[PDB]
Design a protein around this nucleic acid. Sequence first.
DNA 1: GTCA
DNA 2: GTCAC
DNA 3: GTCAC
DNA 4: GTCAC
DNA 5: GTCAC
Length: 377
Amino acid sequence: WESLKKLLVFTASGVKPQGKVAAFNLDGTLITTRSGKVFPTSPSDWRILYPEIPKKLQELAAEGYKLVIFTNQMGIGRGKLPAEVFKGKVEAVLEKLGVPFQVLVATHAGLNRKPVSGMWDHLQEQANEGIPISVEDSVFVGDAAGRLANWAPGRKKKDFSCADRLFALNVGLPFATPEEFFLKWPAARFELPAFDPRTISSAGPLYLPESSSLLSPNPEVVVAVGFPGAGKSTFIQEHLVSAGYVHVNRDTLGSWQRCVSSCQAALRQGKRVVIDNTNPDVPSRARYIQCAKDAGVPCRCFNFCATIEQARHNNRFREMTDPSHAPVSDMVMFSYRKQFEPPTLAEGFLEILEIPFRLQEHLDPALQRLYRQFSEG
DNA sequence: GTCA
DNA sequence: GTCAC
DNA sequence: GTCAC
DNA sequence: GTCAC
DNA sequence: GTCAC
Ligand SMILES: Nc1ncnc2c1ncn2[C@@H]1O[C@H](COP(=O)(O)OP(=O)(O)O)[C@@H](O)[C@H]1O
Ligand SMILES: [Mn+2]
């Protein structure tokens, strides 16, 4: 065993560096509960999932594969499951399996939690003896495979997650469910998430209508509207603030009232101001429209188009890339969704720019890779 | 993020 | 300093 | 309660 | 956390 | 402490 950075690593005696791997998930793939319940009642509540398993694990072992387990255990980092308790469930599990295994445990959220590919990377980079690992000559077996309800005669309930299949996808590993793999069952029906980060691009206009202009040389108030994670601050900094707009932000000032004051003062200095809040509904936007009317200046709306799933994906990406910032929770997202009212001219706007979400152009490579990965099961 |  | 938000 | 598989 | 008290 | 899930 060893305790690393948001990661656990049990390495067995007899585990040998190899250039192909056969990796599995733990719960639901190698073992299951005797209870028939999701989580283990006793710490004795576990049995091998199929009797075929140790036999196949032995063939693979001799056919040269390195044997590895990729398991999410966040209940650990969240204090719902003491490490040493779990630390030895797998030690136990290993013996009944017989074969030498290498175990990688994702204790927390972030790059290491499947479907994101951290644990895999940690293996090719640090956990072998530098010997490369052929992705296509490898394989991942997992039960979190997004299978539909009633995916087989016996099996009624839909999978709780598509995390294992998506992990495979992000890596490029061939994938199979424990039944397809161990029992030679035929591929089951399944569905992937509706939002696919791989097909997001930079193609198309930065804003609509294209006839309009992003900036104005005269004082105005620009009111952003959009989910947290829609990319408002990033866009506003790159195109408005760096050109002289005063950046007014509740996150920074503490209250809408202070935003209003600060907007008022900026207009008094003859400046152009942008309100970088979520501003989801008519009453939130009216605050700033009123300021514009009072100062006798135009008010425009930048309406950020990111969908909830796009914004959630960005939020996950922020957690992994920018930790000093506090994670927005889904509750915040669902609340925005219920509050939301489309911006319209009747509110008193001079115009409304729609700002579609467009992948960042010259994005650094290694972060493009990360951004491209499915980040939730 | 928000304080409606 | 407490309060509703 | 909001980061158990 | 800030607002209005 | 509130919210939607
Ligand atoms: N156009 C874009 N392409 C790729 N990533 C983006 C884009 N806009 C924002 N991001 C990333 O998404 C996250 C949210 O950005 P941010 O501007 O803070 O959103 P908001 O201000 O709407 O909450 C950040 O990680 C940021 O780097
Ligand atoms: Mn922001």
